[PDB]
Every structure is written in C-alpha cells, then in structure tokens.
C-alpha cells in the first residue's frame, strides 16, 4: 500500500446494527433492534435516517490496502 | 453526486514496454527495447526517466471496479 485516499460521495445503505451504536452526525443512539440507521458502504459513517439530509455528501478515507 | 476517485501522488516504477510507447509528458518515444521508462503503478502514466522530474506529483484515477 501507498499514501492514498478514496474520494467521492457517501453511499448510504439501510443497516441492521447488532450492538448499541450512535449517530456519527448528532450523537444520539440509533434506536431500535433492526434497520436503526444508514451506514456508508465506503467509509462506514453511521447516521439516523433523519440525519442523512444533515450531513455533507463528501466521503473520503485513507486507503492502506 | 460524484465519481469515486483514488487520489495520491504518482508511484513510478521502471517498466519493460513490449511495443513502441511514447512519453505521456513530452511526447517523444521511450527509446530502446527494455527498461525504456517508468510507469506509474497507480494510474499508468508513462514517462522518460528525465521527465519524472517534470511532471506534477498529482495522481488521480476514477475507480470503476
Ligand atoms: Zn462515506
Ligand atoms: Zn443522528
Ligand atoms: Zn500516477
Ligand atoms: Zn518525456
């Protein structure tokens, strides 16, 4: 691997959390036992459904693979 | 929306060109039958040794895989 970043926009998908998880935008618990929020398939950001429109679309992460 | 890109700096490595190939910087032939120049391991840019010093470091490509 080299110094490198992946840069794009988020790719959020409905996610079923198996452990208590917080929103990476607002900090409140992702309530529920299933489909509690959205996780970006690329960078892993977790958000409430209602917080999706509050977050910037920019999605970047360092690639070490 | 946006494309996803892999971004960093070039990673040039000496390459054996099997067909006549030109420098992507200056346009002159990569002279010889072996080790004629360097190919960026990330984006594929081909350069003369001397042109390595002349190109911008910026290395980007769209990731379609
Ligand atoms: Zn993301
Ligand atoms: Zn939230
Ligand atoms: Zn490159
Ligand atoms: Zn050249």
Swiss-Prot record, chains A, B:
Zinc finger motifs (Phorbol-ester/DAG-type), residue ranges: 10-59
Protein name from the UniProt record: Protein kinase C delta type regulatory subunit
Species per Swiss-Prot/TrEMBL record: Mus musculus (Mouse)
Gene expressing this chain: Prkcd
Residues of the full protein shown: 231 to 280 of 674
